[PDB]
Amino acid sequence: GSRARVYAEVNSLRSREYWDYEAHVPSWGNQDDYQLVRKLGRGKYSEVFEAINITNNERVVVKILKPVKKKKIKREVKILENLRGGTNIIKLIDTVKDPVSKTPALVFEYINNTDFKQLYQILTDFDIRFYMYELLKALDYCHSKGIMHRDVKPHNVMIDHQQKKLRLIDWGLAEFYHPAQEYNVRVASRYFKGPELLVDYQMYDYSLDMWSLGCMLASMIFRREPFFHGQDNYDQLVRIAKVLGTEELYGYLKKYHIDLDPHFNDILGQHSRKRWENFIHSENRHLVSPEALDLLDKLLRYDHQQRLTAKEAMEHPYFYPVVKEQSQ
Numbered sequence: 001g002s003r004a005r006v007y008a009e010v011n012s013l014r015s016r017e018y019w020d021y022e023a024h025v026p027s028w029g030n031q032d033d034y035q036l037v038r039k040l041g042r043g044k045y046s047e048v049f050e051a052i053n054i055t056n057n058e059r060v061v062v063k064i065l066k067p068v069k070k071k072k073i074k075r076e077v078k079i080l081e082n083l084r085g086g087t088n089i090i091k092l093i094d095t096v097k098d099p100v101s102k103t104p105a106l107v108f109e110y111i112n113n114t115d116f117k118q119l120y121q122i123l124t125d126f127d128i129r130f131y132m133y134e135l136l137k138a139l140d141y142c143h144s145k146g147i148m149h150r151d152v153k154p155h156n157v158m159i160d161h162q163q164k165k166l167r168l169i170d171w172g173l174a175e176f177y178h179p180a181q182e183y184n185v186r187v188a189s190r191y192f193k194g195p196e197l198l199v200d201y202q203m204y205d206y207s208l209d210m211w212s213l214g215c216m217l218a219s220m221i222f223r224r225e226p227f228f229h230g231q232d233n234y235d236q237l238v239r240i241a242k243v244l245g246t247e248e249l250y251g252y253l254k255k256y257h258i259d260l261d262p263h264f265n266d267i268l269g270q271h272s273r274k275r276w277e278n279f280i281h282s283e284n285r286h287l288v289s290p291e292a293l294d295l296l297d298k299l300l301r302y303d304h305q306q307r308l309t310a311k312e313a314m315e316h317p318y319f320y321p322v323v324k325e326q327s328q
């Protein structure tokens, strides 16, 4: 099977209530305290608004949750509440309901997000390190809290590039990691889906997020965003395999006794593992360092279990400038 190398027992060592989100009973505050100001976005299961808490004028984000089973709501809420105070995890300010419809909404702290599409083409090397480190803090935090985000992607990484403030948002796909639990591979967003998802390996873990983060890192340092630009989940793996190599994919599959969806036979082709330096060009050269590549190489590994953990990634020399700057 497969087990997270870290935080594999977080949840089992905690009270069941910590992870038994289905048993979680949110205290649903009154959404009437919030004035929706503007739609910020809409997901499959929610719409998100900038809002003002009219009681204290606090600008917040209200994520109005769509008619999904309350299980997923409880999951997100419980996860968010478990992650409360987690570094760079979006702060769930409150769980509120329209007091009449009882439609639940999550109130999050407001972040002035810098559009990642533009941001990622202008990040400096240090910025990337900085933000990746910030994101890793969130991931290490949530992983340490027994939670996989499972949808790490730029759209879920709010970066206020003015305040250098990063929040990992949208915990709606997040799940508690329980060793040996088989999870839905229909998580994350295509370009950020780890190979494990793409090969329907359900016994994944926090390291899925590290793949996604690796994808983000790759996109940031290489400025190819998304870095692995699959046209669909199949092609996503092909795109990955075109970089990480098909023999390496097969070794991964073999290690986890994964058999490919046979549809991959006629599309994976045969691809040598590419040197990450292959992605360096004049316009990203300044973002790419051996340390970045080494880190990336250790994140974008098929073998989810061999990917760096968030903490390991944070410990990677690539972030030394950030840590050094953090201290000094």
Ligand SMILES: CCN(CC)CCn1c2c(c3c1-c1ccccc1C3=O)C(=O)CCC2
Residues within 6 Å of the ligand: 040, 041, 042, 043, 046, 048, 061, 063, 090, 108, 109, 110, 111, 112, 113, 155, 156, 158, 169, 170, 171
């Ligand atoms: C405003 C910038 N969009 C960029 C994609 C993020 C919108 N967006 C979402 C969420 C949250 C946000 C958001 C923006 C600012 C602060 C806090 C939050 C959230 O919690 C979700 O949960 C569900 C998906 C959408």
Ligand SMILES: [Cl-]
Residues within 6 Å of the ligand: 175, 182, 183, 184, 185
């Ligand atoms: Cl799942």
